[PDB]
Ligand binder design. Structure first.
Ligand code: HNV
Ligand code: NI
Length: 158
């Protein structure tokens, strides 16, 4: 089991960490969502699907910088929605193929009432998503840490 980004960089077998940049709508109002869909960027695969089944959860989703101070959010993981920042590890998603399959995570962020002006700075860290991978074969229990960075400024109109 390993993952890579479209970008792309990779996190190899046994886990590790990688930085991911995302494009964000440059203007968002109170009551609207920024949607940060990571499933078009992060892809994982199972290295031995004929004998091993891999299980992948979102272990934890944390907010930083302008996202932590100026937005409230939810995360959608494999068809279900949860608060973001997260309050517990999600149910698992099965990886059973050597063919890259997207990691099905998307953040929906909406500005809080105090937001105004530049609410997210270009190049700043906005979130960390931890992918946890286990299997039905041995004791492997690995973290894939995705540090999510803003590509561009996001302004909440005043
Ligand atoms: C019984 O014969 C064997 C067949 C396959 C293997 C193996 C292996 C590779 O391990 C990696 O690939 C596995 C499957 O993606 C992961 O679940 C592991 O965590 C790990 O990333 C070991 C023994
Ligand atoms: Ni591989």
């Amino acid at each position: 089991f390993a993952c890579k980004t479209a970008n792309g960089t990779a996190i190899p077998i046994g886990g590790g960490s990688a930085n991911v940049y995302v494009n964000l709508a440059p203007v968002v109002n109170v009551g609207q969502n920024l949607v940060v869909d990571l499933s078009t960027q992060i892809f994982c695969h199972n290295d031995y699907p004929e004998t091993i089944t891999d299980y992948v959860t979102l272990q934890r989703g944390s907010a930083y910088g302008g996202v932590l101070s100026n937005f409230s959010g939810t995360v959608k993981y494999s068809g279900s929605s949860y608060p973001f920042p997260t309050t517990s590890e999600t149910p698992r998603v099965v990886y059973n193929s050597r063919t890259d399959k997207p990691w099905p995570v998307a953040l929906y962020l909406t500005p809080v009432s105090s937001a105004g002006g530049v609410a997210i700075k270009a190049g700043s860290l906005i979130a960390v998503l931890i992918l946890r991978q286990t299997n039905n074969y041995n004791s492997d229990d690995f973290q894939f840490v995705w540090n999510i960075y803003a590509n561009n400024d996001v302004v909440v109109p005043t």
